Amino acid sequence: KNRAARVRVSKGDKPVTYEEAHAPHYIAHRKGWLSLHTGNLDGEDHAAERTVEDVFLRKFMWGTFPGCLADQLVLKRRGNQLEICAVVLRQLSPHKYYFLVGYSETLLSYFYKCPVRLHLQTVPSKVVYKYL
Amino acid sequence: CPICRDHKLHVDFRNVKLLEQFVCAHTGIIFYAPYTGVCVKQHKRLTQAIQ
Amino acid sequence: AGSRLETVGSIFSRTRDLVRAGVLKEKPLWFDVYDAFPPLREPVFQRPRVRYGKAKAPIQDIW
Amino acid sequence: SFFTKLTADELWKGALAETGAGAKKGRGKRTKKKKRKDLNRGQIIGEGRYGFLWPGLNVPLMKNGAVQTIAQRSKEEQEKVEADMIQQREEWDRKKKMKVKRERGWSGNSWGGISLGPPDPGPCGETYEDFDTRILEVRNVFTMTAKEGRKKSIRVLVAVGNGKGAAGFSIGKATDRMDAFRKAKNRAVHHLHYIERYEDHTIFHDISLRFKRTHIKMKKQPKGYGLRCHRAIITICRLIGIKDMYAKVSGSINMLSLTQGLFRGLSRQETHQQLADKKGLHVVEIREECGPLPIVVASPRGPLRKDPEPEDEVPDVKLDWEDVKTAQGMKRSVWSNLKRAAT
Amino acid sequence: EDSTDFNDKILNEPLKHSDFFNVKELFSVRSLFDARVHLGHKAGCRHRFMEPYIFGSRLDHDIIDLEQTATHLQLALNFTAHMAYRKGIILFISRNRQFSYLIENMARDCGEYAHTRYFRGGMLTNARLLFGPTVRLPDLIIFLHTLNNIFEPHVAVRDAAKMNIPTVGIVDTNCNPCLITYPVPGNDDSPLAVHLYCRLFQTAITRAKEKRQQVEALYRLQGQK
RNA sequence: AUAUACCGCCAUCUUCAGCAAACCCUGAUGAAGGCUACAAAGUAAGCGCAAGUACCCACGUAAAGACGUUAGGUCAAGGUGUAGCCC
Ligand SMILES: [K+]
Ligand SMILES: [K+]
Ligand SMILES: [K+]
Ligand SMILES: [Mg+2]
Ligand SMILES: [Mg+2]
Ligand SMILES: [Mg+2]
Ligand SMILES: [Mg+2]
Ligand SMILES: [Mg+2]
Ligand SMILES: [Mg+2]
Ligand SMILES: [Mg+2]
Ligand SMILES: [Mg+2]
Ligand SMILES: [Mg+2]
Ligand SMILES: [Zn+2]
Structure with missing residues (x-):
């Protein structure tokens, strides 16, 4: 039986998001990609470097906004701009979200030597696609 | 036991409301000690106070 | 909380009793009608048995 | 390496090993399982080992109307914070370790006799707060399946009652024990019997019946006699509201047959009013405590017969040798008439 | 204050009369006999619990005592009328497919419900x-x-x-009436018998609903003045 | 060291069509069982199949393929419980 990226059926009490509820074979069919860049296009370079950066940014944001992320990050690159789009919860005070946005944008801009912007969308609770 | 666990319960011939709790209301017999769980020491004091 | 023990008494007795015990807060709509105009036989479950030995049905031939 | 690190959910799912061939068929004799602890519970965003005070994250942004600047706690001031966090963490663990003492049933490890509380409120705002639930038997039953082999299920017997004559019982089945409790107790309220009680404390007459192979002999008793019956009969009688009765169980002692037999006998008893109506005579009670005073307990609602009930010089009633042997002082048992706790 | 008078004049008043809806005028032993209600099944099909209602066997064919049917039918029609008067939900049930269409129409016409299907x-x-x-x-x-x-x-x-x-x-001679509250011994097969039953229940139900409106309307007009 | 503590990713039946929460009913309220269409106690969310999508069609091929079965494979992808080593 295939296991990769499959949330398995339970008793009907497990809420899954739209991203989580779709196995890999639905990628490009029912669900899109969580990062968009040109490195994996034919004739394009630096796919290895874009991949390492993506893995770090996901770990960095998970631990920088602990317990606040309500879904996977969407990473967008245009030119040298890096846009991080995150769906977050509404538990942290707004002052703390502004601190972490200013802190994270600056720290990541100096780390990866590119203009980095963070776009936060807040939701009252994790959006549930179905109960598996 | 019920008597020894509460030091404010005093087995005395004047505390008739406590003594009534160890006598059957329908037959007037004094319960044997296993009925209520009182130790032998307090059951004797209850039987003497009741009498 | 009507009882579903249909083989224990009748719907009237089971309803009448649970009303007395306070289990049923209100009497059902039919209870007062049954009480005023009851059936000839109270509808109590009975198990039908086959006859044995010398037992015969009491139905007579019409001549 | 930073890139080899995983999330807490990944780490706990592995370490706990809740899913695995060992969990499948209880293949291992295991008792104390590791329990996942939430390591982010008491953690504050912005707090670190170095004791830095980040304005707007872990300390207030503005102080005295002016914006605070980056600051760092002193070594001593940071020791207190660390110690205070450890004490708070130990307190959290301490409380979790502390557990409430369960009131036991018929025995310390048995489920029988334990209360399950009132049945759950029905969908249409229906409530059963007046009803109490008692467990009578919890059995682990096993069936053999093609794939999974020996599969484990729970069979529960529960009794419900309000203490005022309305009581019932139901079986519950489920893989989990708490689900079996829910099914049995919620179903039992839909199968309630009404039990007639003499003076709201005892049965109307001696009841002797057999249900399958279980024999139950019950005797009407006066006030103060208590419940001197099989422990399960005691439990059921408290739910019905019977205070004084003697019962003896003979033959197969099966909890489900005992419960079903008990409820059959108690539902099928003739009251004094029914006896008077059936025979159109007065039912007169004679009490030795009241001497020769005749106490009419029930009178027929319809006409009253004029012809005395025939007086058969000798009744052709079947007697129980145990009852006769006791009345003649020939019954010797070290276990009979023993001193017991109030029931 | 006004509810007790309502329930007493409307809900409790019909229950003080032996035949409040005059359902005895709907049928007679002759009307039942012409509808062949007395005809039962052969003796070999007889249910034991129907013997009390059987007049006898005419050449191995059971005959239902219409004197009992008449008394049982009075009780059933009276009960049915009182329940329609109280605005109860009445459900007709029968699996005899020869009469499914007839019964479904009778239910709709009286404003009640039918279940003739599986x-x-x-x-x-x-x-x-x-x-x-x-x-x-x-x-x-x-x-x-x-x-x-x-x-x-x-x-x-x-x-x-x-x-x-x-x-x-x-309940025909091959039926079990133990759990039926108001049984009516009668032929359930002949189209004339079944048609009669549908007319009687339809008429009893329709009359009781009209009686309920008359009483309510009068109770309101008198209430204002 | 332990795949006989596990996550992760998989083989296998599967070139299968079943699994099943929550109820209901039958068996005297036993383990258990639950269908007949001119129908007789089952209703079943969800999951799988199916449907859709990819490739050159609606075909075919891919992909998909639940719950479980073999304490199946892998502690030597990486991570990790327990135990062990630290001149
Ligand atoms: K494995
Ligand atoms: K490994
Ligand atoms: K290891
Ligand atoms: Mg495969
Ligand atoms: Mg051991
Ligand atoms: Mg113990
Ligand atoms: Mg017929
Ligand atoms: Mg293995
Ligand atoms: Mg394939
Ligand atoms: Mg498919
Ligand atoms: Mg192995
Ligand atoms: Mg092998
Ligand atoms: Zn003591």
Whole structure:
């Protein structure tokens, strides 16, 4: 039986998001990609470097906004701009979200030597696609 | 036991409301000690106070 | 909380009793009608048995 | 390496090993399982080992109307914070370790006799707060399946009652024990019997019946006699509201047959009013405590017969040798008439 | 203050009369005899619990005592009328496919309900799941045929007793009346018998509904003035 | 060291069509069982199949393929419980 990226059926009490509820074979069919860049296009370079950066940014944001992320990050690159789009919860005070946005944008801009912007969308609770 | 666990319960011939709790209301017999769980020491004091 | 023990008494007795015990807060709509105009036989479950030995049905031939 | 690190959910799912061939068929004799602890519970965003005070994250942004600047706690001031966090963490663990003492049933490890509380409120705002639930038997039953082999299920017997004559019982089945409790107790309220009680404390007459192979002999008793019956009969009688009765169980002692037999006998008893109506005579009670005073307990609602009930010089009633042997002082048992706790 | 007078003048007043709706004028032993209600099944099909209602066997064919049918029918029609007066939900049930169309139309015409189709497990005992937690079940079930198409009692007879719903039922000589609240011994097969039953219940139900409106309307007009 | 503590990713039946929460009913309220369409106690969310999508069509091929079965494979992808080593 295939296991990769499959949330398995339970008793009907497990809420899954739209991203989580779709196995890999639905990628490009029912669900899109969580990062968009040109490195994996034919004739394009630096796919290895874009991949390492993506893995770090996901770990960095998970631990920088602990317990606040309500879904996977969407990473967008245009030119040298890096846009991080995150769906977050509404538990942290707004002052703390502004601190972490200013802190994270600056720290990541100096780390990866590119203009980095963070776009936060807040939701009252994790959006549930179905109960598996 | 019920008597020894509460030091404010005093087995005395004047505390008739406590003594009534160890006598059957329908037959007037004094319960044997296993009925209520009182130790032998307090059951004797209850039987003497009741009498 | 009507009882579903249909083989224990009748719907009237089971309803009448649970009303007395306070289990049923209100009497059902039919209870007062049954009480005023009851059936000839109270509808109590009975198990039908086959006859044995010398037992015969009491139905007579019409001549 | 930073890139080899995983999330807490990944780490706990592995370490706990809740899913695995060992969990499948209880293949291992295991008792104390590791329990996942939430390591982010008491953690504050912005707090670190170095004791830095980040304005707007872990300390207030503005102080005295002016914006605070980056600051760092002193070594001593940071020791207190660390110690205070450890004490708070130990307190959290301490409380979790502390557990409430369960009131036991018929025995310390048995489920029988334990209360399950009132049945759950029905969908249409229906409530059963007046009803109490008692467990009578919890059995682990096993069936053999093609794939999974020996599969484990729970069979529960529960009794419900309000203490005022309305009581019932139901079986519950489920893989989990708490689900079996829910099914049995919620179903039992839909199968309630009404039990007639003499003076709201005892049965109307001696009841002797057999249900399958279980024999139950019950005797009407006066006030103060208590419940001197099989422990399960005691439990059921408290739910019905019977205070004084003697019962003896003979033959197969099966909890489900005992419960079903008990409820059959108690539902099928003739009251004094029914006896008077059936025979159109007065039912007169004679009490030795009241001497020769005749106490009419029930009178027929319809006409009253004029012809005395025939007086058969000798009744052709079947007697129980145990009852006769006791009345003649020939019954010797070290276990009979023993001193017991109030029931 | 005004509710006790309402329930007393409207709900309790009909219950003080032996025949408040005059349902005895709807039928006679002769009208039943012409509809062949006395005709039962052959003796070999006789159900033991129907012997008290059987006049006898005419050449191995059981004859139903119409004197008893007349008394039982009075009680059943009287009960049915009182339940229609109280605005109860009346459900007609029968699996005899020869009369499914007739019974469904009679139910619609009287403003009541019919179930003549295959009866699915739990329509009554599991109604909240099938229909919804707020579903109202019938206050009276009328069986024009108490047997299913394999000649066993209709499952709704047992389940009606489980749900404490009173049942009126035409019971032929091969039927089991133990759990039917108001049984009516009578022929359930002949089209003339079945048509008669439908007219009597339809008329009893329709009359009781009209009587309820007359009483209410009068009680309101007098209330204002 | 332990795949006989596990996550992760998989083989296998599967070139299968079943699994099943929550109820209901039958068996005297036993383990258990629940269908007949001219129908007789089952209703079943969800999951799988199916449907859709990819490739050159609606075909075919891919992909998909639940719950479980073999304490199946892998502590030597990486991570990790327990135990062990630290001149
Ligand atoms: K494995
Ligand atoms: K490994
Ligand atoms: K290891
Ligand atoms: Mg494969
Ligand atoms: Mg061991
Ligand atoms: Mg112990
Ligand atoms: Mg017929
Ligand atoms: Mg293995
Ligand atoms: Mg393939
Ligand atoms: Mg498919
Ligand atoms: Mg192995
Ligand atoms: Mg092998
Ligand atoms: Zn003591």
